């Protein structure tokens, strides 16, 4: 027997909303807040337009922070594909100091450069469920911005995150490939292999760096939306191994601190392999 995995796009609809939700957490307008895009995430069905919100201010503000900050690091510290793709997203999508994308935009963006599209998403999916979108190559994304307190590193995904972090890799032919690729491989696989394959996807996608002409860049979301572990993972102090998936699998994934190893690829057109040749193992 096979569990349940989705077999088209709009099937996605049955367990995007199988969601581990927040429960700031005294704060009754930022409750109520979180409550308002959950609710946006859990009425959303495929084919919809994503709704598009206004921000406050103070999410405005956040924002503004968190974007400012890190374009003074990205280049130096982002791969060379990042960069390439975050002018685009400014002209197209409206990535400005004052201004925080929407969804649906930048769904639309990623549509006609790679395919990929947007969800959006109440809370944490399980490893499965996300890894699924993904073979359809749609990610799933939070809508809400960060806690004002926390602009430099936030434990929990949120809109900027998704924005700064995600969206411009996933514009880039190579990258996107190699995640659906991790997505098709996850497609009704057993427990210990979905386990595996959302760590080495934690590993890069959200946590590698990779070696170009010679020097180390970040492309990991995560830290490519965090300005404090942005600095961190290239400053030298860090802990730092080649990606090799049966090691990387095994690694643990951490959730309230900064990583204590990243994985180092070559490229993304080598890390794809790398998964190919891992995959056959684990099927
Ligand atoms: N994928 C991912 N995963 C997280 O959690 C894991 C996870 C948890 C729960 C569930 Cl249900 C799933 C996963 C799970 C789901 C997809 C695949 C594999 C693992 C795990 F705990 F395993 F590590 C946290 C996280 N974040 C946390 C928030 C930041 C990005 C990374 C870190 N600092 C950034 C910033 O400051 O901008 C934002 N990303
Ligand atoms: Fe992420």
């Not at 963006?109 to 996300?130: N, Q």
């Not at 959302?198 to 990991?220: S, W």
């Not at 994934?253 to 190919?276: G, H, N, W």
Request: hydrophobic share 35%; aromatic share 14%; net charge neutral.
């Amino acid at each position: 027997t096979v569990p349940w995995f989705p077999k088209k796009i709009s099937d996605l609809d049955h367990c995007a909303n199988r969601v581990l939700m927040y429960g700031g957490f005294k704060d009754n307008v930022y409750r109520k807040r979180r409550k308002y895009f959950a609710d946006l995430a859990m009425n959303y069905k495929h084919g919809d337009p994503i709704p598009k919100v206004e921000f406050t201010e103070e999410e405005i503000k956040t924002w503004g922070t968190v974007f400012q900050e890190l374009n003074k690091l990205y280049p130096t510290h982002a791969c060379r594909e990042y960069l390439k793709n975050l002018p685009l997203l400014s002209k197209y999508c409206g990535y400005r100091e004052d201004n925080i994308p929407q969804l649906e935009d930048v769904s639309n963006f990623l549509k006609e450069r790679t395919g990929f599209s947007i969800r959006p998403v109440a809370g944490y999916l399980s490893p499965r469920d996300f890894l699924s979108g993904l073979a359809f190559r749609v990610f799933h994304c939070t809508q809400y911005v960060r806690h004002s307190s926390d602009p430099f590193y936030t434990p929990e995904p949120d809109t900027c995150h998704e924005l700064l972090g995600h969206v411009p890799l996933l514009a880039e032919p190579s990258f996107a490939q190699f995640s659906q690729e991790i997505g098709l491989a996850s497609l009704g696989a057993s427990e210990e292999a979905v386990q595996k394959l959302a760590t080495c996807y934690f590993f890069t996608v959200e946590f590698g760096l990779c070696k170009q002409d010679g020097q180390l860049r970040v492309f990991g979301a995560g830290l490519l939306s965090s300005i404090s572990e942005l600095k961190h993972a290239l400053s030298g102090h860090a802990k730092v191994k080649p990606f090799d998936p049966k090691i990387t699998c095994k690694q643990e994934c951490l959730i309230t601190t900064f990583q204590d190893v990243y994985f180092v690829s070559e490229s993304f057109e080598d890390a794809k392999e790398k998964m190919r040749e891992f995959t056959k193992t684990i099927k």
